[PDB]
Amino acid sequence: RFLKVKNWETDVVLTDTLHLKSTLETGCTEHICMGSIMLPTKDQLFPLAKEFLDQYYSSIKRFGSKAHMDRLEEVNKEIESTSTYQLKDTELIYGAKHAWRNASRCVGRIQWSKLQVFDARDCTTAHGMFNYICNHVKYATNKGNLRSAITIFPQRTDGKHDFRVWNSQLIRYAGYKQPDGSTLGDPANVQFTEICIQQGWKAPRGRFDVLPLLLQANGNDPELFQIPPELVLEVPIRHPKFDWFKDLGLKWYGLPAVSNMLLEIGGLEFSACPFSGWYMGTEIGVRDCCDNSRYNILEEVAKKMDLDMRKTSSLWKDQALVEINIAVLYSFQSDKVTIVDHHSATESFIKHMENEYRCRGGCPADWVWIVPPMSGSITPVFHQEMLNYRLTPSFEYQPDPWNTHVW
Amino acid sequence: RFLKVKNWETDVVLTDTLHLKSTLETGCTEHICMGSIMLPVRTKDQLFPLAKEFLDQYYSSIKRFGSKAHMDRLEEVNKEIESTSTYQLKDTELIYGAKHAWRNASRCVGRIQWSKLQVFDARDCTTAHGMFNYICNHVKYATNKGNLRSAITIFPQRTDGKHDFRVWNSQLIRYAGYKQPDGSTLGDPANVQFTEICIQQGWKAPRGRFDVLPLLLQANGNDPELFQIPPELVLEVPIRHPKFDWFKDLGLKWYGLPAVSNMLLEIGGLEFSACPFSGWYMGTEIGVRDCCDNSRYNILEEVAKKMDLDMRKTSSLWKDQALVEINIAVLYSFQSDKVTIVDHHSATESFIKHMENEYRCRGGCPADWVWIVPPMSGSITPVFHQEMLNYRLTPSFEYQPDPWNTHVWKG
Numbered sequence: 139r140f141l142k143v144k145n146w147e148t149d150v151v152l153t154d155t156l157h158l159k160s161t162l163e164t165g166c167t168e169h170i171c172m173g174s175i176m177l178p179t180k181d182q183l184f185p186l187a188k189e190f191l192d193q194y195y196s197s198i199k200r201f202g203s204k205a206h207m208d209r210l211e212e213v214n215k216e217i218e219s220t221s222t223y224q225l226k227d228t229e230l231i232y233g234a235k236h237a238w239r240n241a242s243r244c245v246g247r248i249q250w251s252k253l254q255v256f257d258a259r260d261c262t263t264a265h266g267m268f269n270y271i272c273n274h275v276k277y278a279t280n281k282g283n284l285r286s287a288i289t290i291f292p293q294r295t296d297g298k299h300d301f302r303v304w305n306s307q308l309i310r311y312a313g314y315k316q317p318d319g320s321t322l323g324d325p326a327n328v329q330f331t332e333i334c335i336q337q338g339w340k341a342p343r344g345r346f347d348v349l350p351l352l353l354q355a356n357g358n359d360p361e362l363f364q365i366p367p368e369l370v371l372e373v374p375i376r377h378p379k380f381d382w383f384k385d386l387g388l389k390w391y392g393l394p395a396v397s398n399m400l401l402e403i404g405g406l407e408f409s410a411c412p413f414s415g416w417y418m419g420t421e422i423g424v425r426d427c428c429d430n431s432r433y434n435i436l437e438e439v440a441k442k443m444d445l446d447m448r449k450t451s452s453l454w455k456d457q458a459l460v461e462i463n464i465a466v467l468y469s470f471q472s473d474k475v476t477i478v479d480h481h482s483a484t485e486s487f488i489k490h491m492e493n494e495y496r497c498r499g500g501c502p503a504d505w506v507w508i509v510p511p512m513s514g515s516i517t518p519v520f521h522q523e524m525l526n527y528r529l530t531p532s533f534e535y536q537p538d539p540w541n542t543h544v545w
Numbered sequence: 546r547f548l549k550v551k552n553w554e555t556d557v558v559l560t561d562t563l564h565l566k567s568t569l570e571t572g573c574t575e576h577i578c579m580g581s582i583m584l585p586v587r588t589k590d591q592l593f594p595l596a597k598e599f600l601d602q603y604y605s606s607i608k609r610f611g612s613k614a615h616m617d618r619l620e621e622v623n624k625e626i627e628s629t630s631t632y633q634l635k636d637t638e639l640i641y642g643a644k645h646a647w648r649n650a651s652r653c654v655g656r657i658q659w660s661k662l663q664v665f666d667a668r669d670c671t672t673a674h675g676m677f678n679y680i681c682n683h684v685k686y687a688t689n690k691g692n693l694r695s696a697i698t699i700f701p702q703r704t705d706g707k708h709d710f711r712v713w714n715s716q717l718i719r720y721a722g723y724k725q726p727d728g729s730t731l732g733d734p735a736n737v738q739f740t741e742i743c744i745q746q747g748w749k750a751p752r753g754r755f756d757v758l759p760l761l762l763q764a765n766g767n768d769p770e771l772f773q774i775p776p777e778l779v780l781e782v783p784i785r786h787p788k789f790d791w792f793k794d795l796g797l798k799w800y801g802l803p804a805v806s807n808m809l810l811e812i813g814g815l816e817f818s819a820c821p822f823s824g825w826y827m828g829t830e831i832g833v834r835d836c837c838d839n840s841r842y843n844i845l846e847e848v849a850k851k852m853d854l855d856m857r858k859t860s861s862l863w864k865d866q867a868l869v870e871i872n873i874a875v876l877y878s879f880q881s882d883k884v885t886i887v888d889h890h891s892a893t894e895s896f897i898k899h900m901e902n903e904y905r906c907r908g909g910c911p912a913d914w915v916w917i918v919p920p921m922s923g924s925i926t927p928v929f930h931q932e933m934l935n936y937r938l939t940p941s942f943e944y945q946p947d948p949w950n951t952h953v954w955k956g
């Protein structure tokens with residue numbers, strides 16, 4: 139029942155008890171591990187509310203207090219009367235921070251308690267959503283000195299009046315199928331681009347076109363808005379040694395901002411809750427630049443470096459990969475846009491895991507996501523056993539809305 | 546039931562049905578995943594079902610399921626078990642069994658090769674000297690002057706658990722490690738405890754950086770005995786770099802033959818506690834782990850220094866740069882000396898083709914993503930993008946306790 143995790147590099151063993159709280163299911167059974175799979179009423183609501191409020195009142199050292207019992211009763215009466223309830227500001231903020239704290243796939247959680255929470259529960263229209271999001275973008279970007287933020291739109295009611303940001307991130311680049319047969323821009327974003335075009339967006343048909351926002355308020359049909367260009371901070375990619383690197387014409391945007399997830403707090407569902415931090419360099423240099431189905435630039439870089447590409451065993455892919463990742467970190471640092479390298483980030487996560495074990499009795503972590511997509515075993519998380527389990531408040535995946543929306 | 550796995554780079558979806566044949570437990574539950582945990586005497590009554598399921602699988606594989614030969618063999622095994630408490634595998638069943646344990650090894654990226662395995666039957670072995678001779682022959686056969694051949698040697702199965710055959714070494718060939726009084730280590734820090742055991746048992750340690758350990762062998766539950774592998778049978782490759790002429794002066798070399806000797810082979814409920822097996826290396830096993838783990842030879846700094854990398858900040862990626870160069874050096878050296886090695890790109894590409902073939906012809910391929918993905922350049926290998934299902938099929942290779950923890954010393 140009490141489980142140990144071992145670090146195989148340092149021999150340090152930690153005991154996990156926090157997993158006994160876990161509520162949701164993992165996808166695994168005693169017969170089969172699904173660790174590597176990417177996506178595996180009034181009655182229901184009150185126990186979920188109670189469980190959360192219990193944890194909240196515990197955190198402020200007022201468990202079993204008058205104010206604790208009074209709030210529980212107040213929420214009970216509210217659910218019985220209205221079929222739902224409203225979180226106090228203090229609760230919303232706690233909940234948001236804890237959803238991050240509980241995010242098993244996030245290496246950056248040492249930062250979890252420094253999150254700026256923007257309460258957009260008063261928003262009613264898509265134009266309002268656009269204004270809140272521009273403000274989030276400008277606040278988080280902070281002229282390159284990035285600050286973690288989440289903006290929280292109104293909670294789900296009957297599920298026919300959902301707030302959704304249709305975009306997967308606040309800032310991403312368009313992708314277009316060419317008559318040529320090749321793909322211009324980001325191949326990951328072809329379907330969503332078509333939805334935008336189909337809804338009226340005038341597409342520039344370039345390599346690095348920032349997508350408009352497609353915003354849905356109160357379950358109405360979504361609307362297009364372009365983020366003010368001057369609020370989207372971008373970084374041209376160059377290399378400290380290779381003068382030719384800039385001629386590849388590569389750039390990336392500074393703000394990673396996930397907008398397609400659902401925040402669950404105390405049984406309430408926040409279907410539009412864009413959140414942002416700052417990049418770990420491999421997210422851009424390994425994944426965005428080098429994935430076969432993304433910008434896929436390994437060959438072009440290898441050629442400019444004049445590597446022997448006739449045989450895999452020359453490790454030309456590996457050499458080019460490192461150089462691309464060097465250039466990403468150098469360009470962000472030179473322009474003073476916050477970024478963290480995978481060595482620094484994983485070292486921080488190990489310190490954070492130790493804090494969480496010491497202070498909370500554990501830290502749910504998904505090793506498959508936490509270990510960086512390059513140089514895995516030269517980072518300390520590679521040698522760290524991790525236990526993966528689901529705690530609430532949480533960020534959850536949810537269906538893409540175009541599959542779900544009735545026009 | 547059907548389970549689907551998707552490849553996120555190609556959108557190829559595969560359907561697994563083989564998982565329905567899984568028996569043994571994973572460690573995970575519907576509430577916790579233990580997929581990154583490294584390590585998550587049999588009654589008559591339990592043995593006959595295990596024998597039967599294995600024999601059913603064997604007979605199916607030879608398209609003789611339900612035949613007179615199959616039925617007679619079940620009966621013969623049933624009678625042997627009730628009369629002697631155990632049974633003996635036919636040579637054919639043993640070969641099938643060993644090949645399948647490899648086929649079933651979910652942490653092994655090299656399984657495209659599973660059907661090409663030379664099985665040395667050592668069940669007539671009775672003494673440690675006899676084990677030493679079997680193992681020298683395995684090493685010479687497998688080495689094949691650099692043209693490496695996969696092989697396994699199988700010593701007598703467990704009886705009462707008081708007469709076990711064991712190879713105490715974790716691999717047939719490994720380098721000694723010595724903790725110095727000042728807390729530094731000479732040689733391979735992973736092998737310090739075992740080196741101390743070897744010295745206690747009487748080994749005269751050369752005390753250098755690459756001393757091949759002696760074999761420590763236990764026959765029939767007796768105290769283990771020390772033997773030196775003839776040096777002329779131990780193929781080693783000096784590590785040099787194609788462009789950096791200073792690389793050779795780091796004084797590195799590695800052995801050509803990776804041979805796991807500490808695992809237990811389970812076939813039809815029988816337990817072969819001494820079953821050393823060998824193939825050939827994937828380059829990252831040496832260049833990433835053996836050379837660069839902080840707990841192993843740990844050479845990254847010295848390499849980075851010699852390359853004149855900016856070592857003032859991790860964000861120059863000096864570690865990553867030096868890591869690639871070391872791994873180029875390992876592949877270059879093995880190739881230059883005509884010692885079989887495979888790079889991580891080739892190996893993973895071959896694994897994906899193997900896995901797709903298994904899904905189509907066998908209904909699945911249990912695989913442990915945490916182990917299959919190489920420890921460098923993960924996402925530029927096709928396995929990183931492949932969803933996998935991990936479950937346990939028998940026959941199998943299993944971990945077992947280190948024998949110094951369990952052995953009853955005779956004196």
Ligand code: HEM
Pocket residue numbers: 238241243244245246247249253286287288413414415416417418421478483507533
């Ligand atoms: C401040 C710096 C941060 C860093 C360096 C960071 C790091 C990362 C990285 C590298 C990933 C994997 C991304 C991928 O491979 O696609 C990730 C995932 C994730 N992070 Fe963070 N994170 C940060 C901030 C945040 C914040 C502010 C939140 C929420 C408030 C958050 C929540 C999440 C979630 C829910 C995932 C999983 C996303 C998914 O499943 O697609 N992170 N994090």
Ligand code: HEM
Pocket residue numbers: 643647650652653654655656658662695696697805808822823824825826827830887892916942
């Ligand atoms: C023929 C070339 C082979 C290659 C390239 C290869 C590759 C590998 C690699 C890279 C690993 C992970 C090693 C580690 O990180 O410690 C491994 C694990 C393993 N392989 Fe293979 N393999 C080969 C042959 C074999 C053979 C012949 C067998 C047995 C008949 C086998 C059974 C296993 C087992 C049981 C593991 C898991 C070991 C453990 O848990 O420590 N492999 N393989």
Ligand SMILES: Cc1cc(N)nc(COC[C@@H](CN)OCc2cc(C)cc(N)n2)c1
Pocket residue numbers: 246307326394395396413414415416417418421
């Ligand atoms: C908040 C945050 C900070 C940070 N450094 N990184 C992130 C993650 O970035 C967004 C991620 C969410 N999975 O999206 C990238 C992506 C793209 C594609 C095509 C698939 C996928 N799963 N993920 C989020």
Ligand SMILES: Cc1cc(N)nc(COC[C@@H](CN)OCc2cc(C)cc(N)n2)c1
Pocket residue numbers: 655716735803804805822823824825826827830
């Ligand atoms: C047969 C075979 C072929 C091949 N290419 N590689 C292997 C595996 O190599 C041996 C491995 C077994 N995991 O041993 C390395 C090791 C060392 C230490 C200190 C711990 C550990 N778990 N593993 C085995």
Ligand SMILES: C[C@H](O)[C@H](O)[C@H]1CNc2nc(N)[nH]c(=O)c2N1
Pocket residue numbers: 174175176506507508553929930931932933
């Ligand atoms: C199949 C596998 O789960 C998938 O490719 C994963 C692996 N690990 C990952 N790790 C991170 N951080 N991000 C990812 O998108 C993925 N993708």
Ligand SMILES: C[C@H](O)[C@H](O)[C@H]1CNc2nc(N)[nH]c(=O)c2N1
Pocket residue numbers: 146520521522523524581582583915916917
């Ligand atoms: C804790 C973690 O499971 C451990 O460090 C693993 C990860 N993946 C691995 N993969 C391989 N091939 N070999 C290993 O030793 C490990 N070690």
Ligand SMILES: [Zn+2]
Pocket residue numbers: 166170171172173573577578579580
């Ligand atoms: Zn699992």
